[PDB]
Amino acid sequence: EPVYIYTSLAMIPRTNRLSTILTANRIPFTYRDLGTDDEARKVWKTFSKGRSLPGVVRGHNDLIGNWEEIEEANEDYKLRELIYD
Amino acid sequence: IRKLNEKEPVYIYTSLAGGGFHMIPRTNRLSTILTANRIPFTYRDLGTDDEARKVWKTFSKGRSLPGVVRGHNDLIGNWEEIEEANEDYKLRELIY
């Protein structure tokens, strides 16, 4: 399943940190800009439960976590949380 | 398999970490033009998007980024070609 970093390009530098963490864990990703991407907007609004952007989404609508949660999985180094939910 | 009975998606191919000459201002200008013609789009970042990178390398003919692409690989035009066209665009994306 493809992995995305949900963002708002017009969110904050935190996107760059997220990108660095995924690359470090050899996780390929592409960006999704909620400023222009209605699918991403729908997914983030439905599932974020008020969590702030940015974040990581797998496939069409599997919200893995926002930046803070991704940070947390990374210091536990279980960021490959996102392939097993 | 792919979904039927819908419009081909439209992309602005760009490089979000810049580098390319006037990459961000030209991207911003492209965005304004597409929005002006009421054309929905998403960005493709060639820095992280390998297929978008491959598409541009194959079809750009040396044209500089950013540009507009329809579907998987229908390069409509780069920023300059798109700039000139700003008479009717809808015709070049939807009628072609």
Author numbering:
A (entry chain B): 1142 to 1151, 1157 to 1231
B (entry chain A): 1135 to 1230
The authors write:
Here we report a previously unknown budding yeast polarisome protein encoded by YFR016C, named actin-interacting protein 5 (Aip5). Aip5 is found to accelerate the formation of actin filaments in vitro through its C-terminal folded-domain (Aip5-C) and mediates actin cable assembly in cells. Structural studies by X-ray crystallography and biochemical assays have identified that Aip5-C is in a dimeric form, in which the dimer state and a loop region that directly binds to G-actin play essential roles in regulating actin assembly activity. Here we report a polarisome protein Aip5 that aids in actin assembly in vitro and promotes formin Bni1-mediated actin nucleation directly through the interactions toward G-actin and the C-terminus of Bni1.
The structure of Aip5-C was determined by the selenomethionine-multiple wavelength anomalous diffraction (SeMet-MAD) phasing method. The crystalized Aip5-C forms a homodimer, in which protomers A and B consist of four β-sheets in the core region flanked by four α-helices. This structural arrangement can be subdivided into an N-terminal β1α1β2 motif and a C-terminal β3β4α3α4 motif, representing a typical thioredoxin fold. Interactions within the dimer interface are predominantly hydrogen bonds that are formed by water molecules (3, 5, 10, 18, 20, 101) and two β2 strands to stabilize the dimer. Interestingly, superposition of Aip5-C with cGrx2 revealed that the substrate glutathione disulfide-binding site (CxxC motif) of cGrx2 is replaced by a hydrophobic loop (SLAGGGFH) connecting β1 and α1 in Aip5-C. Superposition of protomers A and B showed a root mean square deviation (RMSD) value of 1.5 Å, which indicates high similarity between the two protomers, except for the lack of clear electron density for the loop region between β1 and α1 in protomer B. The loops located in the region of protomers A and B in the Aip5-C dimer run almost parallel with the heads of α1s pointing toward each other. Structural study guided our identification of an Aip5-C loop that directly interacts with G-actin, which is necessary for Aip5 actin assembly activities.
